[PDB]
Design an enzyme around this catalytic site. Structure first.
Site, PDB file in Angstrom:
ATOM      1  N   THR C  48       9.797  -9.993 -10.228  1.00 21.84           N
ATOM      2  CA  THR C  48      10.482 -11.269 -10.405  1.00 21.84           C
ATOM      3  C   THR C  48       9.517 -12.361 -10.853  1.00 21.84           C
ATOM      4  OG1 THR C  48      12.110 -10.646  -8.734  1.00 21.84           O
ATOM      5  CG2 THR C  48      11.921 -12.988  -9.264  1.00 21.84           C
ATOM      6  N   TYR C 137       6.065   0.934  -2.538  1.00 20.53           N
ATOM      7  CA  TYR C 137       7.277   0.815  -3.331  1.00 20.53           C
ATOM      8  C   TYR C 137       7.952   2.171  -3.444  1.00 20.53           C
ATOM      9  CZ  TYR C 137       7.459  -3.907  -5.375  1.00 20.53           C
ATOM     10  OH  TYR C 137       7.604  -5.260  -5.575  1.00 20.53           O
ATOM     11  N   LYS C 165       9.081  -1.508   0.524  1.00 20.56           N
ATOM     12  CA  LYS C 165      10.066  -2.247  -0.265  1.00 20.56           C
ATOM     13  C   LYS C 165      10.946  -1.216  -0.961  1.00 20.56           C
ATOM     14  CE  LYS C 165      10.687  -5.470  -4.078  1.00 20.56           C
ATOM     15  NZ  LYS C 165      10.247  -6.768  -4.645  1.00 20.56           N
ATOM     16  N   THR C 167      13.579  -0.539  -3.248  1.00 20.52           N
ATOM     17  CA  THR C 167      14.391  -0.994  -4.377  1.00 20.52           C
ATOM     18  C   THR C 167      15.194   0.190  -4.922  1.00 20.52           C
ATOM     19  OG1 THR C 167      12.734  -2.678  -4.870  1.00 20.52           O
ATOM     20  CG2 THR C 167      14.376  -2.207  -6.563  1.00 20.52           C
ATOM     21  N   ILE C 206      13.720  -8.424   0.075  1.00 14.04           N
ATOM     22  CA  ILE C 206      12.944  -9.191  -0.892  1.00 14.04           C
ATOM     23  C   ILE C 206      13.778  -9.268  -2.163  1.00 14.04           C
ATOM     24  CG2 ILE C 206      10.842  -9.358  -2.246  1.00 14.04           C
ATOM     25  CD1 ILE C 206       9.479  -7.697  -0.001  1.00 14.04           C
ATOM     26  N   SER C 208      15.088 -11.727  -5.749  1.00 11.31           N
ATOM     27  CA  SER C 208      14.917 -12.842  -6.669  1.00 11.31           C
ATOM     28  C   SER C 208      15.953 -13.932  -6.428  1.00 11.31           C
ATOM     29  CB  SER C 208      15.009 -12.334  -8.109  1.00 11.31           C
ATOM     30  OG  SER C 208      16.232 -11.647  -8.322  1.00 11.31           O
TER      31      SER C 208
HETATM   32 CL   LIG Z   1       9.692  -8.635  -7.359  1.00 15.08          CL
END
Ligand SMILES: [Cl-]
Ligand SMILES: [Cl-]
Ligand SMILES: [Cl-]
Ligand SMILES: [Cl-]
Ligand SMILES: [Cl-]
Ligand SMILES: [Cl-]
Ligand SMILES: [Cl-]
Ligand SMILES: [Cl-]
Ligand SMILES: [Cl-]
Ligand SMILES: [Cl-]
Ligand SMILES: [Cl-]
Ligand SMILES: [Cl-]
Lengths: 298, 297, 297, 297
Positions: C48, C137, C165, C167, C206, C208
């Site tokens: 981001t 990640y 994290k 995602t 987390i 944006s």
């Molecule tokens: Cl990010």
């Protein structure tokens, strides 16, 4: 080397239907004779191109017997007997055996995620019902949804009874790897749009839906590469791909049947629902293609 | 008007030293080595060159060294592509200063960019290139940009574009592009389908394996021109045997190792996170080098 | 013993100016704006943050300013990830000097790296981080690294890893990770399934979009703890109405445009090849800024 | 006016005998077992029911048997889906004769059909259904049909459609479908995200694992309505421990094996090419059956 009679160019036979979507036995016989007259080496009956997965077992058997009557002893006969069910595939394989087919074929069972050993036992059972005629295994990662490995491909084509591989993959690195690992294997190019390149990569033949309307062009690419006339092979492939472009725009199966209709081979160019019919705006192009192909013959 | 861009051009590896700094002495010898192979040009600073683990200052250093060694002897193509358009422009201006024959840029990756954003990206680089042609990319695999024929038409017809690096195994699209653009300079990207790529429409090639066996690929070109399809197949077999091995050991590090056993590179290290070659592969890689050297002459 | 990393933490945008230089003043304003929203921490230099169109020097500067503005007030997480391990280490050591509470590194992308090469990459960064925890990640989408549960176990159990994290929209995997690591700090990556991500095992996020409406995600966290599953659903609806607009106009540039109309950022530009927002979306984005501003107070 | 189609409904398995013919006796006992679990309906002849290794005549036999056992007791949904439209119409007319409360058809697969061809397929089945609502699929995984929100909005607004079986892990699209269609009957397809799927917008589920532990899923529905998010997570955890086992052994054959050790089915065979369960897994599957039986009393 004992099943060398399976090599060559073999149209993936379309299945003609009538106005009510039942089999058109009269048009089917004319299509078999039309392909024989093109000089093909064999015919691939009841495959994906034949709309086998919208037909019943009894219907697929009906088609297998009619083609065998017209073609047995004249050109090589390959019956696609593949189903998701192993038992249904065995029924068609035994039927192909009774009809005198030269070989059987089976697409890797799809929809459900089967293990690789399950795929092998599936081919082992069909091979047993084939009762002595070779099996043409499949390697179609696209439509079926089965991504394989070289060592897996090597295990399939080595199964007792397998005599050929139908490589319906655009990955010509794998094509070369298969040829390098199995110099004697009968290896069909499955994508007509890369036929010339598929042969150069290792394939020694092809099975394609567009052969039904212009098999001589594909026979000519084989001749050109044997002769060392790469420019002629390229020009031939350009023309084939101009056609395939049109067939993709209008629908491959229904487009091929429409051309065969304007060629006075098929009485009805219908595919079974949910295949929609050809749009009116495309009829002029398809008729002109037929005239081009018919004048191009002689 | 840019037929001087056709041919076989190795995607140049970037040699590093024991501490992963640029090995200027080995880089100059690698360029000499490729020139001595008969290549038509050299492709500097690409993915094969480990550009995306180098700095802009380092990529400029490599560009300036190769230009010194090669300018006037073979065609020079500088891959100036980054994700940032500004960074890409900086390397395009530098390649122009160093007297490169062409620039190139990979499609901006990682972030999803629109096709218009790709075209503007290239326009900005074509402007900083300041009169030298641009080579565009159609690489749907590593970059992650799946394109369309009409989109390919708009890229190759951008003012300033002079060639297309076709990094795709789809030889139907290869043919469609050649059919649509007969004069287009069209590089085959995947060495493992090189012979098939040429027959499908490609008139050249940019490959990482050319660094160690360019004469084979140059041979495939000659074989298909002479109508010796059997010979072309045999050469591609031998190329694909090697590629089988390079895939097993690591392509870039395996190539550098072969070049090290060829006494071209002093250190075959790639930059971390690339690990070094496993000890159990050194024998095969040395045997390969001895084979390629005796095959050379 | 690192429970201070749990919570809602905006993925920080990197403001630029008219000439696409880093806008240090707007950056400070953004860090202060998020602290007023009540976030538990800030995630600096991430995707981001447009990290991959910035230089190492530029990212170090953004890290240092955020530390000046927030250190001692909220949790500070520095994304130091690069494709190059050495480059990632430099940023890791820098975040250590700036006093960051933890670091983060996206899985090195573009090139195919073995899972062992990923682990060594993380080991090297953790060593350079010199005693602050690492956030790993699992981003299969943009990075292109599809992992396995056992591989996830090896990563989150590396010496030095303190959080993950996640995602990924695969909330089966989210549940398997929580079941296998009951105390792991687990951030939900995609803001459009934040409520469902928490229920599947995440204990934070987390995002944006937190930059313009962190209170909604903070309220979802509160609604789920209270058992008001209706409130959590309605809050997620509103967040997704906004995400619908951002996807249409461009997420990063649309977020900065809202922040611009909130008087936080001076220039809502991203760096090329990101194009600016189309004039036809300006009215909608402004109307959203007034809604969000009136919504808070 | 199709609210009666909401709730938890097991995807009925099709029991076979040692010779792999339909085991009518075990089928009837499976329907009674699900009815005894408190389900709201039964989904017959679907993917879980191994419909695509059966014949039209066989699928009709199952539909009629289930209707005898269940009609007037729980909602009846017949999956009439085939690749062929005419075959799908035959089963739709049979479901009408047997008094099913609704029909369902997977998007025709294997061949690439246009979206318009999908609609005419559904339109044709709705006509042969002769007045009972249609349940359309959105299964991008197994079928291989990736759809768009607007396309989803066209399928569920076709005259005759009364519900959507959402077999997608993408809970962003789930929330978008719910926000676009507040009244839509929306089944969660993947059992492993059932709790998160409801939170995203789904108001029911159709799952294969419901045949052995529907009370856990019915309990998740209650836990969320109660606001006991903690209990919902615990139930989903326990459900996913089972699914972990079923994935390892084979989901359908594993479920049938558990049902066999529950003395519901006499033979746990799936039809070839599905292989039988491996012997080394029997101990666990029997332990699971014993656990579930004691769990419900
Ligand atoms: Cl990010
Ligand atoms: Cl076929
Ligand atoms: Cl598989
Ligand atoms: Cl040949
Ligand atoms: Cl005729
Ligand atoms: Cl490269
Ligand atoms: Cl210098
Ligand atoms: Cl300032
Ligand atoms: Cl400062
Ligand atoms: Cl301001
Ligand atoms: Cl189902
Ligand atoms: Cl609810």
């Amino acid at each position: 080397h004992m099943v060398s009679h399976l090599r060559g160019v073999m149209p993936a036979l379309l299945t003609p239907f009538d106005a009510q979507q039942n089999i058109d036995r009269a048009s089917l016989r004319r299509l078999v004779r039309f392909n024989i007259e093109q000089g093909v080496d064999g015919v691939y009956v009841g495959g994906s191109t034949g709309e086998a997965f919208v037909q019943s077992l009894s219907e697929r058997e009906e088609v297998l017997e009619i083609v065998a009557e017209e073609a047995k002893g004249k050109i090589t006969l390959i019956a696609h007997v593949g189903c998701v069910s192993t038992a249904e595939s065995q029924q068609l394989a035994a039927a192909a055996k009774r009809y005198g087919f030269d070989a059987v074929s089976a697409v890797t069972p799809f929809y459900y995620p089967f293990s690789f050993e399950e795929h092998c036992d599936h081919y082992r059972a069909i091979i047993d019902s084939a009762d002595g005629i070779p099996m043409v295994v499949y390697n179609i990662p696209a439509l079926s949804g089965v991504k394989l490995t070289l060592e897996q491909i090597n295990q399939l084509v080595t199964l007792p009874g397998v005599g050929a591989l139908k490589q319906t993959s655009g990955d010509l690195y794998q094509m070369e790897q298969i040829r390098r690992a199995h110099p004697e294997l009968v290896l069909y190019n499955g994508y007509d749009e890369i036929f010339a390149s598929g042969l150069l990569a290792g394939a020694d033949g092809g099975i394609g839906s567009t052969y039904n309307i212009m098999a001589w062009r594909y026979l000519g690419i084989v001749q050109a590469l044997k002769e060392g006339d790469t420019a002629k092979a390229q020009q031939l492939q350009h023309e084939c791909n101009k056609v395939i472009d049109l067939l993709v725009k209008v629908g491959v199966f229904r487009g091929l049947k429409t051309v065969l209709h304007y060629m006075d081979v098929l009485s009805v160019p219908l595919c079974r629902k949910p295949f929609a019919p050809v749009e009116d705006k495309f009829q002029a192009e398809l008729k002109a293609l037929a005239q081009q192909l018919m004048q191009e013959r002689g």
